[PDB]
Amino acid sequence: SSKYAVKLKTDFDNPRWIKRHKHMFDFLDINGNGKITLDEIVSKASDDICAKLEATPEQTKRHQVCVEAFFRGCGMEYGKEIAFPQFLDGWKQLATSELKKWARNEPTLIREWGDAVFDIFDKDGSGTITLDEWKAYGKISGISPSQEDCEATFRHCDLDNSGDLDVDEMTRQHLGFWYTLDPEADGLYGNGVP
Ligand SMILES: O=C1N2C=C(c3ccc(O)cc3)N=C(Cc3ccccc3)C2=N[C@]1(O)Cc1ccc(O)cc1
Ligand SMILES: [Cl-]
Structure with a gap:
């Protein structure tokens, strides 16, 4: 064996990355008081999204476990209000941890959350999400209600031979979009998320 240096592509001080998460923070901050909680x-995730998608009790439970792990990765814990500066600092730590797992080819928290979401739409067990299924998610989660933005997501990604999206591709895109500000990921959510 031998050691190999890999570049963890981060640009935490770039306004484009900061604004991307500020947009999402405001999106989660429903009452606009500058604070959100786990x-x-x-x-x-559970009472709203999974309920409307009619996910099974077990799929909802698994999805919740993944969401809890993901945001706890950002330093969020039950019962504690979080303002944007802390939220952003938490994302810096999550991104760094995730990118290291990524380099070591160990499953990431974003991949596992993805598995849980894809599972909900896995009617035939092939593990793919169709454009119509994504449109449903975008509207219900509210992250991308625009049909055009949902089509932009699929157009942006490299789809399988049937025109559907798989988790392996979406995970790579999400990593570049949420953690690294990779140019290859720009436009992942169309005009829905900067
Ligand atoms: O990536 C995704 N998200 C990122 C953020 C988000 C939140 C805060 C930030 O600062 C940055 C990003 N918020 C939501 C929507 C959401 C939020 C909270 C609970 C449930 C859903 C969200 N849904 C995902 O498409 C779901 C998913 C994950 C992996 C896949 O392969 C496919 C689909
Ligand atoms: Cl992966």
Whole structure:
């Protein structure tokens, strides 16, 4: 064996990365008081999204576990209000941890959250999400309600031979979009998210 240096592509001080997360923070900050909690995020995931997607009790439970792990990775814990500066600092730590797992080819928290979301739409067990299924998610989660933005997502990604999207591709895109500000990921959510 031998050691090999890999560049963890981060640009945490770039306004484009900061604004991307500020947009999402405001999106989660429903009442606009500048504070959100893990409790609210989990309620959104379980009581709102999974309920409307009619996910099974077990799929909802698994999805919740992934959401809890993901945002705890950002330093969020139940019962504690979080303002943007802390939220952003948490994303810096999450991104760094994720990118290291990525370089070591160990499953990331974003990949696992992805598995849980794709599972909900896995009617035939092939593990793919169709454009119509993504449009449903975009509208219900509210991250991308625009049909055109949802089509932009699929157009942006490299789809399988049937025109559908798989988790392996989406995970790579999400990593570049949320963690690294990779130019290859720009436009992932169309005009829905900067
Ligand atoms: O990536 C995704 N997200 C990132 C953020 C988000 C939140 C805050 C930030 O600062 C940055 C990004 N918020 C939501 C929407 C959401 C939020 C809370 C609870 C449930 C859903 C969201 N849904 C995902 O498409 C779901 C998903 C994950 C992996 C896949 O392969 C496919 C689909
Ligand atoms: Cl992966």
